[PDB]
PDB file of C-alpha atoms and ligand atoms in Angstrom:
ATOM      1  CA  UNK A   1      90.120 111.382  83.152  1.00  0.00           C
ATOM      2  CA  UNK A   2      93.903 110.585  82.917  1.00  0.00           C
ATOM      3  CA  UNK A   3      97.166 111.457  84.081  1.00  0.00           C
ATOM      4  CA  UNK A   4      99.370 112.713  81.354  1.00  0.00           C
ATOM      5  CA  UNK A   5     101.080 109.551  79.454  1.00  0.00           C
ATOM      6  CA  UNK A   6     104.256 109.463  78.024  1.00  0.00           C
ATOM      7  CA  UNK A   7     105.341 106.177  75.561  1.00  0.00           C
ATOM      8  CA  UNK A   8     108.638 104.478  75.124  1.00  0.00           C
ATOM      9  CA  UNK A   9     109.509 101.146  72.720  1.00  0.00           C
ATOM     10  CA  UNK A  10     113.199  99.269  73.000  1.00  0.00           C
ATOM     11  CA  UNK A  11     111.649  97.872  69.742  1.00  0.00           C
ATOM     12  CA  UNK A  12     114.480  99.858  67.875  1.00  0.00           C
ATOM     13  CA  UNK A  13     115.286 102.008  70.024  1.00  0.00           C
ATOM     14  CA  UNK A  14     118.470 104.341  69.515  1.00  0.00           C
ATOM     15  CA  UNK A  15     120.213 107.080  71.343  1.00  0.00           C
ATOM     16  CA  UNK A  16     117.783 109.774  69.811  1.00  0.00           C
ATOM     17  CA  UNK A  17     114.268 107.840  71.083  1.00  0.00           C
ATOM     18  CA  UNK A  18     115.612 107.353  74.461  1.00  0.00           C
ATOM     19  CA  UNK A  19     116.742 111.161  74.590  1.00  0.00           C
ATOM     20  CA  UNK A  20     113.372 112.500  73.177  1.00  0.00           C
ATOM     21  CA  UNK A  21     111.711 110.338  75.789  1.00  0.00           C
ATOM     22  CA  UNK A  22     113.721 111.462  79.163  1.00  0.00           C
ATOM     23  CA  UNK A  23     113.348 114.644  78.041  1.00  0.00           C
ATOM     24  CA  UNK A  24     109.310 114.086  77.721  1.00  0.00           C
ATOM     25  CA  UNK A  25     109.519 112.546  80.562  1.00  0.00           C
ATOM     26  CA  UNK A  26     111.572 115.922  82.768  1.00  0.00           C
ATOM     27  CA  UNK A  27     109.069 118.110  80.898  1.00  0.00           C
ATOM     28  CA  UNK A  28     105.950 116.520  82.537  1.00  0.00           C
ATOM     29  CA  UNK A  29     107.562 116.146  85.760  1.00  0.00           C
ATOM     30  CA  UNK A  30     108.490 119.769  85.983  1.00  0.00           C
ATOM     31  CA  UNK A  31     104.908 121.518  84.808  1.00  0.00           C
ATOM     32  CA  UNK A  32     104.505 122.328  88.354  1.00  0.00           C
ATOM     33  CA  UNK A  33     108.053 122.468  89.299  1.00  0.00           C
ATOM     34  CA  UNK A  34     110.182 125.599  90.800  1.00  0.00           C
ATOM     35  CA  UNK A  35     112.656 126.662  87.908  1.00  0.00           C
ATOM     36  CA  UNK A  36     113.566 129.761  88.993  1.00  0.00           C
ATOM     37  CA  UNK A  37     117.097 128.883  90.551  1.00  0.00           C
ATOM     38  CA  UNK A  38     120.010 127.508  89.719  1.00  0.00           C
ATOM     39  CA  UNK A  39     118.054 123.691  89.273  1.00  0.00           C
ATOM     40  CA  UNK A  40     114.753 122.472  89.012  1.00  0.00           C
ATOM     41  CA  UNK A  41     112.805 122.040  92.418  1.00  0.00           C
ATOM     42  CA  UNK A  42     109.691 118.972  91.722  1.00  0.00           C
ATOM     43  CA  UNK A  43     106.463 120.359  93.611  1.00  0.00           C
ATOM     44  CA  UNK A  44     105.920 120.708  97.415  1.00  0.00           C
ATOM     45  CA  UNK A  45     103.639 116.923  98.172  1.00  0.00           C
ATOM     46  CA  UNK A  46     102.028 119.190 100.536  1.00  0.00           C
ATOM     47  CA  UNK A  47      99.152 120.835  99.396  1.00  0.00           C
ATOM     48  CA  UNK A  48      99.449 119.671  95.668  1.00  0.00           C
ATOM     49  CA  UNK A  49      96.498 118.515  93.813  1.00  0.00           C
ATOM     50  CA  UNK A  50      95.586 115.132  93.332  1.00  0.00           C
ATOM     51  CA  UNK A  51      95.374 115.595  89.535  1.00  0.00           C
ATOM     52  CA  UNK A  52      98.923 116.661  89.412  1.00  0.00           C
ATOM     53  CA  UNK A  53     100.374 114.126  91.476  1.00  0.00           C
ATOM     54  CA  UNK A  54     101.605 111.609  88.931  1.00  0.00           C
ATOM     55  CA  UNK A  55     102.835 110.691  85.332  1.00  0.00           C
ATOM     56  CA  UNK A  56     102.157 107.719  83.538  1.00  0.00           C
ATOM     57  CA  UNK A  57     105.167 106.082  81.523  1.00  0.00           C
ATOM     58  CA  UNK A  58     104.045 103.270  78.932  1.00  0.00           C
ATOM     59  CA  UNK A  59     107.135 100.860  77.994  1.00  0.00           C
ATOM     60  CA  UNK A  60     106.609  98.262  75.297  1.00  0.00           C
ATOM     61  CA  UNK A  61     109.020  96.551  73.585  1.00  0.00           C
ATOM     62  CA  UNK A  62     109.539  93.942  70.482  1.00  0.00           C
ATOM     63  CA  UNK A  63     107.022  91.727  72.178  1.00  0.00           C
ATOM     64  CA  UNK A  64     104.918  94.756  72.210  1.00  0.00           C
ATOM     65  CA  UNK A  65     103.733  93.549  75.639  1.00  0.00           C
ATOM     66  CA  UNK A  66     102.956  96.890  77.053  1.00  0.00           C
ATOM     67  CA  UNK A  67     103.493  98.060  81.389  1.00  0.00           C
ATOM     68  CA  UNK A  68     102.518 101.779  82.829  1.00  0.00           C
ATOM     69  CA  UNK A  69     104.738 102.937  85.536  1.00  0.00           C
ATOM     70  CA  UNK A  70     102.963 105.347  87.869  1.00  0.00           C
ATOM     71  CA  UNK A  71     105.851 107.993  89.280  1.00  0.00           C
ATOM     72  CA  UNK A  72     105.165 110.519  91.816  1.00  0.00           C
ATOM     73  CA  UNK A  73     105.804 114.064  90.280  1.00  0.00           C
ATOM     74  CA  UNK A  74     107.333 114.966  93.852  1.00  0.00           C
ATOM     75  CA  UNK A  75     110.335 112.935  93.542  1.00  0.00           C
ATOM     76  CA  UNK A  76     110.567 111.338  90.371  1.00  0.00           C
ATOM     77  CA  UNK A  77     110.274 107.613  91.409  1.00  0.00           C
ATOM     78  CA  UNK A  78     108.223 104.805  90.619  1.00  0.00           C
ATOM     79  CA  UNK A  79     105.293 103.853  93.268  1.00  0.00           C
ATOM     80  CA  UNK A  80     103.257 101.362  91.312  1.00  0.00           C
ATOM     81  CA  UNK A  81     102.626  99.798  87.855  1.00  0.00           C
ATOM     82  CA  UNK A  82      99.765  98.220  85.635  1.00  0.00           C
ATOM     83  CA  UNK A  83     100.375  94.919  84.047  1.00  0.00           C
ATOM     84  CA  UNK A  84      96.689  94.359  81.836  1.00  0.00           C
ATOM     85  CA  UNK A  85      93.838  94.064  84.492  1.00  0.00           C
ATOM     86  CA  UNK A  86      96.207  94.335  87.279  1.00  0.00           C
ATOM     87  CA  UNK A  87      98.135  97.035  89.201  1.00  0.00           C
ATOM     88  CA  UNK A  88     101.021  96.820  91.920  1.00  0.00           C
ATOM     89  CA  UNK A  89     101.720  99.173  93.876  1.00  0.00           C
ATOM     90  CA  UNK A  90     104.675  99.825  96.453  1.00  0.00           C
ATOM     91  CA  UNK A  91     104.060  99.407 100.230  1.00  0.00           C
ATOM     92  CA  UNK A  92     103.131 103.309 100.769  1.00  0.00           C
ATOM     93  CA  UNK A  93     104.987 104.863 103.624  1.00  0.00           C
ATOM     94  CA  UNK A  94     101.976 106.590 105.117  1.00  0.00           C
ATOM     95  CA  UNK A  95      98.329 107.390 105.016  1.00  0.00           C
ATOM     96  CA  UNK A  96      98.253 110.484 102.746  1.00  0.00           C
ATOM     97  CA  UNK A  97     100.693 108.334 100.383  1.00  0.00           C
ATOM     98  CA  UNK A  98      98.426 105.386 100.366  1.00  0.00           C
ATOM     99  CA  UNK A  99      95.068 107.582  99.969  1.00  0.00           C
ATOM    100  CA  UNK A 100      96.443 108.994  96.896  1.00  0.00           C
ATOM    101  CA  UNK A 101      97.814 105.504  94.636  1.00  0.00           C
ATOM    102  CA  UNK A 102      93.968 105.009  95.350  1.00  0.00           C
ATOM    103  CA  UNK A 103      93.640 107.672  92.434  1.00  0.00           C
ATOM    104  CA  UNK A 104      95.691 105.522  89.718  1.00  0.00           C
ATOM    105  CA  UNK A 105      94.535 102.824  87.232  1.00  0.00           C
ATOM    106  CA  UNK A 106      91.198 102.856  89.028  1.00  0.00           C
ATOM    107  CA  UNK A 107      89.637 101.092  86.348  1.00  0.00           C
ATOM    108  CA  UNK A 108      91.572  97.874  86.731  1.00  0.00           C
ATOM    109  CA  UNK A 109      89.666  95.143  88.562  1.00  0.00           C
ATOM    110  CA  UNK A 110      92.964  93.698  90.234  1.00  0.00           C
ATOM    111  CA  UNK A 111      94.906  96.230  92.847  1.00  0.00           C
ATOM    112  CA  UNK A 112      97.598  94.949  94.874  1.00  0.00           C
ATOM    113  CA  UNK A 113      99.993  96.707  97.374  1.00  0.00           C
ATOM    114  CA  UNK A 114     103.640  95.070  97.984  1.00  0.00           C
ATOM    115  CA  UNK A 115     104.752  94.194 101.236  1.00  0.00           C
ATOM    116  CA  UNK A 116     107.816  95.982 100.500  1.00  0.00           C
ATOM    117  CA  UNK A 117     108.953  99.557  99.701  1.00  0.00           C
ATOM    118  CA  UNK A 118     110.529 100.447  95.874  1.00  0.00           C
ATOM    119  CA  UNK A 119     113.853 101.276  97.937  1.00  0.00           C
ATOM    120  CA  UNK A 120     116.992  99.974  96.424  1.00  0.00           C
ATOM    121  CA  UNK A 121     118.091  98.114  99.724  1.00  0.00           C
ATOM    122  CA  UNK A 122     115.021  96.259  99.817  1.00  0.00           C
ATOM    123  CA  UNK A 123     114.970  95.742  95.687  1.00  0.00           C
ATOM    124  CA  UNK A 124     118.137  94.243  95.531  1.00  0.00           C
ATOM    125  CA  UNK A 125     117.554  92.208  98.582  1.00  0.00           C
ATOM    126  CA  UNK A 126     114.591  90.698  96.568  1.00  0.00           C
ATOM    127  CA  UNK A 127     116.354  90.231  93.976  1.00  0.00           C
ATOM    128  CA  UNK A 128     119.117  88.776  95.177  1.00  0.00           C
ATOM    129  CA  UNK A 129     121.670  90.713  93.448  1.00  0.00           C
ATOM    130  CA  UNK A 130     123.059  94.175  94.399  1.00  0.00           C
ATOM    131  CA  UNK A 131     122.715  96.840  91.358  1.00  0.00           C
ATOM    132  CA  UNK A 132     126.704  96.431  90.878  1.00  0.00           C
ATOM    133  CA  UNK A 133     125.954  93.243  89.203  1.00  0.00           C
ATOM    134  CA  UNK A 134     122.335  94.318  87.361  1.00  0.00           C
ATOM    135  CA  UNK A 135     123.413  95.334  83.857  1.00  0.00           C
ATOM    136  CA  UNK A 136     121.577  98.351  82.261  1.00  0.00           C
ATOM    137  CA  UNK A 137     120.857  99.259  78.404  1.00  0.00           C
ATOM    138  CA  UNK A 138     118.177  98.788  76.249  1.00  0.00           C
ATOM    139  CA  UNK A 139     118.534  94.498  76.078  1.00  0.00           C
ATOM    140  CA  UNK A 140     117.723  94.912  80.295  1.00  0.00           C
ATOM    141  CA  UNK A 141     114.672  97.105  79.715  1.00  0.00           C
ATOM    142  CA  UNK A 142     113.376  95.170  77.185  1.00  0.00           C
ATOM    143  CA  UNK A 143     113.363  91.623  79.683  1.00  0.00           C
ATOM    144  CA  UNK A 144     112.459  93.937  82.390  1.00  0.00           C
ATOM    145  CA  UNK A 145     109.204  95.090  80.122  1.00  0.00           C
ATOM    146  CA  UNK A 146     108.396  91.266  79.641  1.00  0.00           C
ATOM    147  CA  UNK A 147     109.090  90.415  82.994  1.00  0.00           C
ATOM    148  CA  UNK A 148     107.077  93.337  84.283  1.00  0.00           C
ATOM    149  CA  UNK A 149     104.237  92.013  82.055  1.00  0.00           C
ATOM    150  CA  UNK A 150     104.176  88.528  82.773  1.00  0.00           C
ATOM    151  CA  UNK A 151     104.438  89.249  86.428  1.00  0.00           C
ATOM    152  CA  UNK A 152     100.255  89.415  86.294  1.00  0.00           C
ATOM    153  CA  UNK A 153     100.201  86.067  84.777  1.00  0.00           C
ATOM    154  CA  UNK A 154     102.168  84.061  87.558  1.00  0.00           C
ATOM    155  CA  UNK A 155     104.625  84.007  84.633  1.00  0.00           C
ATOM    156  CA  UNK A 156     107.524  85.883  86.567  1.00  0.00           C
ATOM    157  CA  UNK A 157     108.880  85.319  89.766  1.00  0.00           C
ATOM    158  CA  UNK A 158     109.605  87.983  92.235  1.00  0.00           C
ATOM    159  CA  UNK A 159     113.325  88.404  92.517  1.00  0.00           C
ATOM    160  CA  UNK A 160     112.884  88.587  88.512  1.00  0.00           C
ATOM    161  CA  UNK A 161     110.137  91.011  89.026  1.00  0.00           C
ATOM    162  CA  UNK A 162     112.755  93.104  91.429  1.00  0.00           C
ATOM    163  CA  UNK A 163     115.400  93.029  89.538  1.00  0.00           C
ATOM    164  CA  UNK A 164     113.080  94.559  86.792  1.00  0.00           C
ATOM    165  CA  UNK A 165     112.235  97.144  88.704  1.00  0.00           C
ATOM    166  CA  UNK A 166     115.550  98.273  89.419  1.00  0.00           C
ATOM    167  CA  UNK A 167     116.584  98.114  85.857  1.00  0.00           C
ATOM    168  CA  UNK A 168     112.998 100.670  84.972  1.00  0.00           C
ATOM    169  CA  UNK A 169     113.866 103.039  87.859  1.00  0.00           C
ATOM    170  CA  UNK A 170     117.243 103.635  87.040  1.00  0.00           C
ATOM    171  CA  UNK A 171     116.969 103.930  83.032  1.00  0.00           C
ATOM    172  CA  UNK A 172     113.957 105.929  83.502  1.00  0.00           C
ATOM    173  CA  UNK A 173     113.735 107.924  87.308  1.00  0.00           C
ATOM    174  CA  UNK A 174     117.266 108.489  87.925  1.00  0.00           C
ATOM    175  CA  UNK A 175     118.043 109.184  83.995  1.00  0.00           C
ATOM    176  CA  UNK A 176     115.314 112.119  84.787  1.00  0.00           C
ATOM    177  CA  UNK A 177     117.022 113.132  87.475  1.00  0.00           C
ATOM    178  CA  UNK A 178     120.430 112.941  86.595  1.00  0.00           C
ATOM    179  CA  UNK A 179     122.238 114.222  83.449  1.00  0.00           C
ATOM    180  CA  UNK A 180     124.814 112.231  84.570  1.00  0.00           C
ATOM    181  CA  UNK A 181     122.724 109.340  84.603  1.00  0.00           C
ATOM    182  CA  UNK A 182     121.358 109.525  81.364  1.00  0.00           C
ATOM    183  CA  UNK A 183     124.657 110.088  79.740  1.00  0.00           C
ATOM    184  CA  UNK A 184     125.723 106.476  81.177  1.00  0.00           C
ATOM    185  CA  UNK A 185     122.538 104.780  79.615  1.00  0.00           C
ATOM    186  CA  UNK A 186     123.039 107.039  76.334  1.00  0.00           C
ATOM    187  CA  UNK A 187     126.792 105.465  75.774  1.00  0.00           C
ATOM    188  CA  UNK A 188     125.503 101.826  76.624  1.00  0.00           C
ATOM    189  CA  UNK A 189     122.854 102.411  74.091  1.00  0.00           C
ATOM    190  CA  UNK A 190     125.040 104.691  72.018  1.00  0.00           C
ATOM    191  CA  UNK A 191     127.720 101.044  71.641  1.00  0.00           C
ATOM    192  CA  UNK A 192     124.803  98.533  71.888  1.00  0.00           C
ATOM    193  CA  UNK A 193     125.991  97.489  75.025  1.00  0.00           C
ATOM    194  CA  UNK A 194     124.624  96.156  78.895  1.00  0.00           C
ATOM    195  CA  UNK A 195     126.904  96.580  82.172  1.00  0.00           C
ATOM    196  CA  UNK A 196     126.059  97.123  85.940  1.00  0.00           C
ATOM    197  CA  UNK A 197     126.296 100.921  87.167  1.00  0.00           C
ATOM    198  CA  UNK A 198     129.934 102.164  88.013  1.00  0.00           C
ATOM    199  CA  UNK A 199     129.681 103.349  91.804  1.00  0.00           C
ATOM    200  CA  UNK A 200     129.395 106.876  90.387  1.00  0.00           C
ATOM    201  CA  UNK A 201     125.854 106.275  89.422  1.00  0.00           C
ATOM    202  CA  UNK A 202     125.269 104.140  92.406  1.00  0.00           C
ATOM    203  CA  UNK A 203     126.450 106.853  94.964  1.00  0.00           C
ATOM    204  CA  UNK A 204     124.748 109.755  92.630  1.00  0.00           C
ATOM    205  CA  UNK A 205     121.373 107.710  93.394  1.00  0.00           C
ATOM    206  CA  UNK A 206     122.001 107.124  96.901  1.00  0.00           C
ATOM    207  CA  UNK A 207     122.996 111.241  97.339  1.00  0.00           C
ATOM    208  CA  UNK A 208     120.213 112.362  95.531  1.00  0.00           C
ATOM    209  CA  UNK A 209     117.949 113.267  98.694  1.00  0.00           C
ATOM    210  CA  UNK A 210     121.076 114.678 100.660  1.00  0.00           C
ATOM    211  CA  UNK A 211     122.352 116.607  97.202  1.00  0.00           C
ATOM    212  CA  UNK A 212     118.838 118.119  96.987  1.00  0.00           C
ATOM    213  CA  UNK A 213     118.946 118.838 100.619  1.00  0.00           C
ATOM    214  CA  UNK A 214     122.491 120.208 100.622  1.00  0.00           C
ATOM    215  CA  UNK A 215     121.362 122.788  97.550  1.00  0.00           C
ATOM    216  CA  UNK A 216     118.173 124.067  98.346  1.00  0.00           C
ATOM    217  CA  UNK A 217     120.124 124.914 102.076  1.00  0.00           C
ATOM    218  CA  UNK A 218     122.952 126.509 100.808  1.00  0.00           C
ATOM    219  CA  UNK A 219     123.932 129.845 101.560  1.00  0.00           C
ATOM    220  CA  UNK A 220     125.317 132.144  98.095  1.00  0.00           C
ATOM    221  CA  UNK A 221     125.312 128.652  96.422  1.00  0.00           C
ATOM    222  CA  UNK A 222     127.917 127.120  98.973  1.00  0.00           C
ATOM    223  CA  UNK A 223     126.892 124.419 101.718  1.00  0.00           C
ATOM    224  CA  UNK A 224     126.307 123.991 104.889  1.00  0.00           C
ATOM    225  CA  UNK A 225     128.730 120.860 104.689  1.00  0.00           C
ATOM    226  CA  UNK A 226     130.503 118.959 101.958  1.00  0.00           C
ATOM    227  CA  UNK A 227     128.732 115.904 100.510  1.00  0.00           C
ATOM    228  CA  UNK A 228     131.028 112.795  99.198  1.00  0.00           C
ATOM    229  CA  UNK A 229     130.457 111.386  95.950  1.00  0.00           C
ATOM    230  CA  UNK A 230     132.685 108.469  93.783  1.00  0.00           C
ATOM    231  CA  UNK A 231     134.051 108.510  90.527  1.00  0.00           C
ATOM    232  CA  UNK A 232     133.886 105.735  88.293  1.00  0.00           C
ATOM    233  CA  UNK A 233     136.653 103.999  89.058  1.00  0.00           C
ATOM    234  CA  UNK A 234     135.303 104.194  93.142  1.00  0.00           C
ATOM    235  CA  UNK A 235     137.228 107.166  94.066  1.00  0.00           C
ATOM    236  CA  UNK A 236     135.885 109.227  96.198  1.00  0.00           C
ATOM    237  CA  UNK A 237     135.544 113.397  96.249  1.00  0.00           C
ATOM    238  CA  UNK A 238     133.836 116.061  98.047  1.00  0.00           C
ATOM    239  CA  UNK A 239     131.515 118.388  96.809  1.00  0.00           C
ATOM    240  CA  UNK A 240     130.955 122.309  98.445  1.00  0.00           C
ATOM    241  CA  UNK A 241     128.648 124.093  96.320  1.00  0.00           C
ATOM    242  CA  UNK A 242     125.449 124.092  93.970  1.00  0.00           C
ATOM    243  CA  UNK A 243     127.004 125.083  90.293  1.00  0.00           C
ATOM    244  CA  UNK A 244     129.470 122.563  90.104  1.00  0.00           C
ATOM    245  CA  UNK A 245     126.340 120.221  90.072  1.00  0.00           C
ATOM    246  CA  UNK A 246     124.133 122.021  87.883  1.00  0.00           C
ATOM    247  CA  UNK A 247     125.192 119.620  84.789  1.00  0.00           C
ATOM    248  CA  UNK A 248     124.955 116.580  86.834  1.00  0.00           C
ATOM    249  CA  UNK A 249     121.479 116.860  88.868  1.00  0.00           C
ATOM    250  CA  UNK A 250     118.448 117.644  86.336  1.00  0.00           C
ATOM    251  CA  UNK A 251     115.858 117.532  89.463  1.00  0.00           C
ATOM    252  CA  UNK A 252     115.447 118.095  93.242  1.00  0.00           C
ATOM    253  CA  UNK A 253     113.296 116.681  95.609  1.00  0.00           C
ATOM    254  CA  UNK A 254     111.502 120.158  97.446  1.00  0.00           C
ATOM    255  CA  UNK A 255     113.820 120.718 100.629  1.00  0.00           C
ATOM    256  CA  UNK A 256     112.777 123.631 102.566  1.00  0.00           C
ATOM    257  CA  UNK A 257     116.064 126.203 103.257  1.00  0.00           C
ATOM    258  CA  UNK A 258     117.433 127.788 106.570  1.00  0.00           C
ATOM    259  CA  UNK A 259     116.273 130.371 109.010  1.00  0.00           C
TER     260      UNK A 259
HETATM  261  O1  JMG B 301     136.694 110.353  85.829  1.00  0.00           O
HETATM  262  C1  JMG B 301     135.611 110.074  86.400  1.00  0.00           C
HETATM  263  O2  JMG B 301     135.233 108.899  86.544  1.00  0.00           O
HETATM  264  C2  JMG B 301     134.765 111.165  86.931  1.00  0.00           C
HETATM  265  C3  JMG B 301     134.989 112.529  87.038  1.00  0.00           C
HETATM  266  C4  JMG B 301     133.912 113.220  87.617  1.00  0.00           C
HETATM  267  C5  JMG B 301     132.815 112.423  87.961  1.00  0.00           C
HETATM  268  C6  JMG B 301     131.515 112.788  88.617  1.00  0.00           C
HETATM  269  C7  JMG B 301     130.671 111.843  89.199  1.00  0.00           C
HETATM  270  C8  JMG B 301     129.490 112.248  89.818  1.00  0.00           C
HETATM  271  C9  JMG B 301     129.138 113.599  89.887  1.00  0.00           C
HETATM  272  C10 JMG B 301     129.978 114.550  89.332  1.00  0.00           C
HETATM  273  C11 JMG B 301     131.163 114.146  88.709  1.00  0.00           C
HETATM  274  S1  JMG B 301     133.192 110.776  87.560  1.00  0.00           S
END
């Protein structure tokens, strides 16, 4: 009947909870994943089952008001969510990706699809604030969950609703996909503490398409081309080959290698 589910709480939540739960969540997203080089490849979209296609992530918090994210098991990321008798879904970016959200929460009587893409551009443009300035930790998820929640009421109001999402998708899809990542929300919840992403995790999730892209092409583990990432203090360096990454990117996006 379902797709497989996997639970998180900020209602105590410490540095052991939210590492059990990214690594729940990697392990469902890479049942049907390519781990036989040098870092995980998520399945082909083409040709993969509908039953495969998507995870289910529960968040509740100390409200115990309770939201299911639906993410794609082909790149990690977010494409809808259910809020009680209501789901929301992402503006799909074609047919086959529309046809298949069709296959999630289909017992709720309310579906609704988003004018708008779960992009960070557009996010932040909805929500008025760029992710520089959208603090992250456990306190953020927790109003996110809420806001998420009340969204289905007419309780929350869209650029709140946005900025929500940006705060789930980071802590939870680009935490799965980056080691990195999770490291920065394990120290913020490690010290109790909220702050906006460095630009290390802001390039990171902007590179993680052309990283993916950049590995799965490379020749003896060196690439094609360098690709530029920052440091945290905005510095900037170049990267030229796949193992210097291997702590750094959990996940790839399938990228289909040279003639
Ligand atoms: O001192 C620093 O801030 C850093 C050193 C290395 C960093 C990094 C960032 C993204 C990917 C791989 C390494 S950040």
């Amino acid at each position: 009947k379902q797709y497989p589910i996997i639970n998180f709480t900020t209602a105590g939540a410490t540095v052991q909870s939210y590492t059990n739960f990214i690594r729940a969540v990697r392990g469902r997203l890479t049942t049907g994943a390519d781990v036989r080089h040098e870092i995980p490849v998520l399945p082909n979209r083409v040709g993969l089952p509908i039953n495969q296609r998507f995870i289910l992530v529960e968040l509740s918090n100390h409200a115990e008001l309770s939201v299911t994210l639906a993410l794609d098991v082909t790149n990690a990321y977010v494409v809808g969510y259910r809020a009680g008798n209501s789901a929301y879904f992402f503006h799909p970016d074609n047919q086959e990706d529309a046809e298949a959200i069709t296959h999630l929460f289909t017992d709720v009587q309310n579906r609704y699809t988003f004018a708008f893409g779960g992009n960070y551009d557009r996010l932040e443009q909805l929500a008025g604030n760029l992710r520089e300035n959208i603090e992250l930790g456990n306190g953020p998820l927790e109003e996110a969950i809420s806001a998420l929640y009340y969204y289905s009421t007419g309780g929350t109001q869209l650029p709140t609703l946005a900025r929500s999402f940006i705060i789930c998708i980071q802590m939870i899809s680009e935490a799965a996909r980056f080691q990195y990542i999770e490291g920065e929300m394990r120290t913020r919840i490690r010290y109790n503490r909220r702050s906006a992403p460095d630009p290390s995790v802001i390039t990171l999730e902007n590179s993680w398409g052309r990283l993916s892209t950049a590995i799965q092409e490379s020749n003896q583990g060196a690439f094609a081309s360098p690709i530029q990432l920052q440091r945290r203090n905005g510095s900037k360096f170049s990267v030229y080959d796949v193992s210097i990454l291997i702590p750094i990117i959990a996940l790839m996006v399938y990228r289909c290698a040279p003639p």
